[PDB]
Design a protein around this motif. Structure first.
Motif, short mmCIF file in Angstrom:
data_model
loop_
_atom_site.label_atom_id
_atom_site.label_comp_id
_atom_site.label_asym_id
_atom_site.label_seq_id
_atom_site.Cartn_x
_atom_site.Cartn_y
_atom_site.Cartn_z
N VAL A 171 -14.93 -12.50 -71.76
CA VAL A 171 -15.87 -13.51 -72.16
C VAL A 171 -17.41 -12.87 -72.25
N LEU A 176 -19.20 -13.57 -75.79
CA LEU A 176 -20.66 -13.95 -75.87
C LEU A 176 -21.24 -12.88 -76.20
N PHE A 225 -11.74 -14.06 -61.60
CA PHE A 225 -13.02 -14.88 -61.18
C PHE A 225 -12.40 -16.38 -61.38
N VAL A 227 -13.78 -20.50 -60.80
CA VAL A 227 -14.60 -21.63 -60.76
C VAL A 227 -13.95 -22.77 -60.22
N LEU A 229 -12.97 -26.62 -60.42
CA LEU A 229 -13.52 -27.71 -61.37
C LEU A 229 -12.91 -28.95 -61.32
N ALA A 246 -9.55 -26.85 -68.29
CA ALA A 246 -10.67 -25.90 -68.12
C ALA A 246 -10.36 -24.87 -66.98
N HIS A 250 -9.66 -20.57 -68.29
CA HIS A 250 -10.49 -19.78 -67.73
C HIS A 250 -9.72 -18.92 -66.63
N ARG A 312 -18.08 -26.58 -60.96
CA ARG A 312 -18.70 -27.36 -61.68
C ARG A 312 -17.75 -28.64 -61.93
N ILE A 314 -16.57 -31.16 -64.90
CA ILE A 314 -16.00 -31.13 -66.48
C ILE A 314 -16.01 -32.61 -66.96
N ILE A 326 -14.97 -20.80 -77.43
CA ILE A 326 -13.97 -20.85 -76.38
C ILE A 326 -13.91 -22.54 -75.74
N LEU A 327 -15.27 -22.89 -75.46
CA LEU A 327 -15.59 -24.26 -74.92
C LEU A 327 -15.16 -25.15 -75.94
N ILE A 332 -14.34 -29.10 -73.90
CA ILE A 332 -15.02 -29.56 -72.63
C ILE A 332 -16.47 -28.95 -72.59
N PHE A 334 -19.35 -28.42 -69.05
CA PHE A 334 -19.46 -28.12 -67.84
C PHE A 334 -20.88 -28.18 -67.44
N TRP A 345 -26.60 -19.09 -61.11
CA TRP A 345 -25.70 -19.73 -61.62
C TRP A 345 -24.64 -20.33 -60.40
C1 LIG Z 1 -20.39 -20.09 -64.03
C2 LIG Z 1 -19.91 -21.20 -64.59
C3 LIG Z 1 -18.69 -21.08 -65.53
C4 LIG Z 1 -17.97 -22.19 -65.92
C5 LIG Z 1 -16.96 -22.27 -66.70
C6 LIG Z 1 -15.70 -23.03 -66.45
C7 LIG Z 1 -15.07 -23.59 -67.87
C8 LIG Z 1 -13.95 -22.77 -68.01
C9 LIG Z 1 -13.84 -22.89 -69.89
C10 LIG Z 1 -14.32 -21.46 -70.58
C11 LIG Z 1 -15.87 -21.29 -70.79
C12 LIG Z 1 -16.08 -19.92 -71.16
C13 LIG Z 1 -17.42 -19.83 -71.55
C14 LIG Z 1 -18.41 -19.76 -70.41
C15 LIG Z 1 -19.89 -19.52 -71.01
C16 LIG Z 1 -20.44 -20.32 -71.87
C17 LIG Z 1 -21.78 -20.80 -71.72
C18 LIG Z 1 -22.65 -20.58 -72.98
O1 LIG Z 1 -22.58 -21.73 -73.93
O2 LIG Z 1 -23.31 -19.79 -73.45
#
Ligand SMILES: CCCCCCCC/C=C\CCCCCCCC(=O)O
Ligand SMILES: CCCCCCCCCCCCCCCC(=O)O
Ligand SMILES: OC[C@H]1O[C@@H](O)[C@H](O)[C@@H](O)[C@H]1O
Length: 466
Positions: A171, A176, A225, A227, A229, A246, A250, A312, A314, A326-327, A332, A334, A345
């Motif tokens: 990611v 990004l 990693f 998170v 949810l 979600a 991830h 987080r 959702i 991806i979002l 979704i 968050f 964060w």
């Molecule tokens: C550190 C908190 C991360 C929470 C993500 C959990 C949701 C899982 C779904 C995939 C998201 C992938 C993109 C995450 C960063 C996007 C932020 C942005 O809009 O720039």
């Protein structure tokens, strides 16, 4: 609160985050050398890991810290570009080998078990130039690097993490573009990187299994990693389903192929295939595994390595406009609960780790679990008497104890991020995760314990809580 007899208490570092010596003794440049040297405010105050904690020069100081804590395990990473300046075994940097062998031998002298990460966000620049994780070439490059490490260090190292947080890497680096090589490819680059990262990991596992396991008798995984949810509106079915999806997007996107059946989660395949078609792509933005590839990937992890910091809420968010990301693929959004405390964060939600451990147990057939990273940062000015942060730790250890006792999760190792205040990627030195304070203005980079260090040492010594 007595933990299991033989429970592993550890701390973690990463090569780029602590070593310095970025060009010492013939070391090749990695993508973070290039990226931080470019400046342009992508890192806090244009900071670099040129020196960082100076651990390449000051290992003896790190060892003092490790001994003070009474750690049973110590997690650290091997710098690919330090060992193999061009990425290949055509040229080996012996001073690199000597350095890591000194870490390993010292740890074993002292009864400390190494947990070694092969690759921690820090590709050699040469290999990034040849395409990095977007190109197939990387798979063989990585497999050969892994075999070199297994060969060189595996007579003494029995616990390996091939790739640190392949999900974060995919990611941040390729979707990004917040990490090197720093080019945004929303909705596309992440999935391509992920696909090659999964294949590369599986290949390295098979190399270990075929060539090294019989003699070395160790185990190999990759860290993910996670998170935790929760639905934003706990009564909303779409929110409930969106939080589940979600987690699937991830975490399970990686963990399902490797631990379960060699293929992506079905909701991931169907969501991306559908948006891709509407967007006018002739093929899904998620690359497919071949049937042979599914067979090779399935069952390529000896334990589950997870890295937990935060939770987080959702909310379902329909991708009405067919937007690319991806979002949007997961449909979704968050956000934190207003009530939660935070630094950067990292929102403090200790019970999140309990939910996660139960999820891993339920979803991945009750595996052996190592938490290879967990911790809390402080901002500047960071107090040495960090009593509030220790309280977050204390609550987290209570959640671990519950997951073990109540939920019967097979958690064997807990690894605190980090042993040292260090270079926290884009946040540079402004995010202080260390159990030991480091003064980056002082050329000697002296380590001094936070209160957390003293308190953690007590937990370890008592193997449990008050
Ligand atoms: C550190 C908190 C991360 C929470 C993500 C959990 C949701 C899982 C779904 C995939 C998201 C992938 C993109 C995450 C960063 C996007 C932020 C942005 O809009 O720039
Ligand atoms: C391309 C694979 C899709 C799977 C999505 C993985 C999402 C990982 C979690 C979000 C990124 C968190 C970044 C780490 C912390 C930070 O630097 O802010
Ligand atoms: O993603 C959360 C964490 O990931 C680790 O791999 C990294 O070493 C930490 O500095 C932090 O970024």
């Amino acid at each position: 609160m007595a933990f299991p007899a033989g429970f592993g208490w550890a701390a973690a570092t990463a090569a780029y985050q602590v070593e310095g010596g970025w060009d010492a003794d013939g070391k090749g440049p990695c993508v973070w050398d290039t990226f931080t040297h470019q400046g342009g405010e992508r890192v806090f105050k244009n900071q670099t890991g040129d020196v960082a904690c100076g651990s390449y020069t000051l290992w003896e100081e790190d060892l003092k810290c490790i001994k003070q804590l009474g750690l049973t395990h110590y997690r650290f990473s091997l710098s690919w570009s330090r060992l193999l300046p061009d990425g290949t075994t055509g040229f080996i940097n012996q001073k690199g080998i000597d350095y890591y062998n000194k870490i390993i031998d010292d740890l074993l002298k002292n009864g400390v078990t190494p947990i070694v990460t092969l690759y921690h966000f820090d590709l050699p620049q040469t290999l990034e130039d040849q395409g990095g994780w977007l190109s197939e070439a990387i798979i063989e490059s990585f497999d050969k690097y892994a075999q070199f490490c297994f060969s060189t260090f595996g007579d003494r190292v029995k616990q390996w993490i091939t790739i640190n947080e392949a999900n974060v890497l995919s990611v941040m680096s390729y979707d990004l573009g917040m990490f090197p090589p720093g080019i945004p490819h929303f909705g596309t680059g992440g999935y391509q990187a992920a696909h090659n990262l999964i294949k590369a990991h599986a290949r390295s596992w098979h190399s270990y299994d075929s060539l090294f396991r019989k003699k070395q008798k160790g185990m190999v995984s990759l860290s993910l990693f996670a998170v935790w949810l929760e639905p934003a509106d706990p009564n909303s079915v779409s929110d409930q389903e969106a939080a589940k999806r979600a987690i699937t997007f991830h975490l399970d996107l990686f963990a399902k192929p490797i631990f379960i059946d060699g293929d992506y989660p079905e909701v991931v395949k169907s969501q991306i295939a559908s948006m891709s078609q509407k967007q006018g792509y002739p093929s899904s933005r998620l690359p497919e595994f071949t049937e042979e590839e599914k067979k090779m990937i399935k069952g390529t992890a000896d334990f589950f390595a997870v890295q937990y910091y935060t939770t987080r809420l959702i909310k379902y968010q329909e991708n009405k406009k067919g937007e690319l990301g991806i979002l949007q693929d997961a449909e979704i959004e968050f956000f934190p609960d207003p009530s939660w405390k935070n630094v950067d964060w990292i929102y403090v939600v200790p019970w999140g780790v309990c939910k996660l451990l139960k999820y891993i147990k339920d979803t991945y057939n009750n595996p052996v679990i190592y938490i290879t990273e967990n911790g809390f940062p402080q901002s500047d000015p960071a107090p040495l008497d960090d009593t509030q942060r220790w309280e977050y730790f204390r609550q987290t250890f209570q959640e671990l104890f519950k997951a073990i006792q109540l939920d019967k999760v097979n958690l064997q190792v807990y690894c605190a991020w980090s042993l040292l205040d260090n270079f926290e990627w884009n946040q540079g030195y402004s995010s202080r995760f260390g159990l030991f304070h480091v003064d980056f203005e002082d050329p000697a980079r002296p380590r001094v314990p936070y209160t957390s260090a003293k308190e953690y040492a007590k937990i370890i010594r008592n193997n449990g809580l008050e």
